[PDB]
């Protein structure tokens, strides 16, 4: 209901910058790497499926983890523990029926105890100072989707996939804000399915132009093309389900001609 669409868009645009993880954080992590993070995040995608969790939940969890790691140095043996707690918190915040803590202790093949997961939860809350209501690519996509004319849910499902793919590779996507990745995602989806471009209406709304999206778009397009060969594959599997009109089964465009 548009009476608040602009006010909210404005707000998320302010807040995304306040809730943004610190871009070079992995360099300062002495024992973990981009590649460990990919693994963890990819696992999270898996957990999301098992428990039929919302995509929003995935995206918040990722946000939490990246923020947590921007100030808390963590050993690889404990990365999953952070992951688990983020996901739990994300579920609590976003889900109608979050899975119970016992279920979270389950999916970590008994690596951690309930008491640990609960303690870690408390520490993530303390570190993120309870600021959990963070803007996500999803929230941006969803608004952009109001500008398709007409809706094509092949496009919508395709954008969600691309968006989601970006969670996995902190290099390079950690340096782009959600609103911008949403931008690229939507444009790339739109182009692939229908051959149209980032609408003029979205220029007016977002201030972003094809020009301003180019950097991120290049990164994304490449990620799309190399998706079949990526080390992590949970998202591709997920996005074959009829639920998302098997969009992962679509061929990425060879060129963008920007």
């Amino acid at each position: 209901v548009p009476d608040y669409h602009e006010d909210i868009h404005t707000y998320l645009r302010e807040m995304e910058v306040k809730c943004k993880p610190k871009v070079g954080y992995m360099k300062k992590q002495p024992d973990i790497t981009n590649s460990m993070r990919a693994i963890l995040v990819d696992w999270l995608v898996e957990v999301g499926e098992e428990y039929k969790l919302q995509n929003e939940t995935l995206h918040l969890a990722v946000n939490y983890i990246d923020r947590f790691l921007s100030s808390m140095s963590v050993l690889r043996g404990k990365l999953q523990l952070v992951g688990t707690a983020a996901m739990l918190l994300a579920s609590k915040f976003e889900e109608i029926y979050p899975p119970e803590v016992a279920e979270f202790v389950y999916i970590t093949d008994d690596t951690y105890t309930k008491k640990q997961v609960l303690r870690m939860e408390h520490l993530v809350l303390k570190v993120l100072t309870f600021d959990l209501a963070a803007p996500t690519v999803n929230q941006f996509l969803t608004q952009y989707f109001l500008h398709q004319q007409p809706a094509n849910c092949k496009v919508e499902s395709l954008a969600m996939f691309l968006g989601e793919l970006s969670l996995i590779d902190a290099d390079p996507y950690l340096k782009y804000l959600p609103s911008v990745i949403a931008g690229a995602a939507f444009h790339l989806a739109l182009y692939t399915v229908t051959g149209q471009s980032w609408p003029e209406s979205l220029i007016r709304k977002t201030g972003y132009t094809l020009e301003s999206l180019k950097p991120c778009l290049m990164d994304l397009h490449q990620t799309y093309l190399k998706a079949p060969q990526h080390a992590q594959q949970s998202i591709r599997e997920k996005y074959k389900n009829s639920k998302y009109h098997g969009v992962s089964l679509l061929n990425p465009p060879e060129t963008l001609n920007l």
């Binding site: 803590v101 309930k114 209501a133 929230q139």
Partner: protein, 297 residues
């Protein structure tokens, strides 16, 4: 951590926790403390507290209760709020013999709509507006409180929890099982509360979901496809619903002047899409002369 706070008395009980009045021994400030027990062994920090805190920190506005601090322990979690002196419900009951003066009704409704627009403009639903959760101070302020059921929403919304809003103040799109609901559900709550300030009794005191619908219908008319495109499709719509004629609004809340009736009528429009937004409400001619009287506690 609480070394500095001095308990004065219990005030009551939340969507959880116990609430106390306390003073800060060093600054003299009077606060309300919401105390939540946690454990380990169980389910960790309750999602109500997670939401209430996270949302309440973003919502900083003069007609929204101020969350001042959050105190952690292993086992205990304390939410420190600004103290406010009573709630609307307590107030209305005290105003038994005299009624609440119209300039004060107007002030209170203006401020609630201010605070509610602020929530809505930051993608928050209150989902539990009622006199018990509207707090008033000794200087004319009234403030939204108890964000226990509040939630952050997206544009467009998706399906959120159904078991939502206290019965008497529940919007009909919820009672009818509609898969989406939004901001409009909070405005309906204000609508009801606005009528309740005037008449001092509750507008629709139903004791079940069916009784509650029937009360709405007998006042506003049974909605059909003309008043509300789509109703005859909704999950809990029944074609056997009695069809009641809409009652003339002057009869609904007799003491209201023409402007008041207009406002109230739009706040209770059945079709959520056409129902009024808090934002739009603040420009309504009802408020042309609004001031800010102090009440009498």
């Amino acid at each position: 951590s609480m070394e500095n706070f001095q308990k004065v008395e219990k005030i009551g009980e939340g969507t959880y926790g116990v609430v106390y009045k306390a003073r800060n021994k060093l600054t003299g400030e009077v606060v309300a403390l919401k105390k939540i027990r946690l454990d380990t062994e169980t389910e960790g920090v309750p999602s109500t507290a997670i939401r209430e805190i996270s949302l309440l920190k973003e919502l900083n506005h003069p007609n929204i209760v101020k969350l001042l601090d959050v105190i952690h322990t292993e086992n205990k979690l304390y939410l420190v709020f600004e103290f406010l002196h009573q709630d609307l419900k307590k107030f209305m009951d005290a105003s038994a013999l005299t009624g609440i003066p119209l300039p004060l009704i107007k002030s209170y409704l203006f401020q609630l709509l201010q605070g509610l627009a602020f929530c809505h403009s930051h993608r928050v639903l209150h989902r539990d507006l009622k006199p018990q959760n509207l707090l008033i101070n000794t200087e004319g302020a009234i403030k939204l409180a108890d964000f226990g059921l509040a939630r952050a929403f997206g544009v467009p919304v998706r399906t959120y929890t159904h078991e939502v809003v206290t019965l008497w103040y529940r919007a009909p799109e919820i009672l009818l099982g509609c898969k989406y609901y939004s901001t409009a559900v909070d405005i309906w709550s204000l609508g009801c509360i606005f009528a309740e300030m005037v008449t001092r009794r509750a507008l629709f005191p139903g004791d079940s979901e069916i009784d509650q619908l029937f009360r709405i219908f007998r006042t506003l008319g049974t909605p059909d496809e003309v008043v509300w495109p789509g109703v005859t499709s909704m999950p809990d719509y029944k074609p056997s619903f009695p069809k009641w004629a809409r009652q003339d609004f002057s009869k609904v809340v007799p003491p209201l002047d023409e402007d008041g009736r207009s406002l109230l009528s739009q706040m209770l429009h059945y079709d959520p899409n056409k129902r009024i937004s808090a934002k739009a409400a603040l420009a309504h001619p009802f408020f042309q002369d609004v001031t800010k009287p102090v009440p009498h506690l």
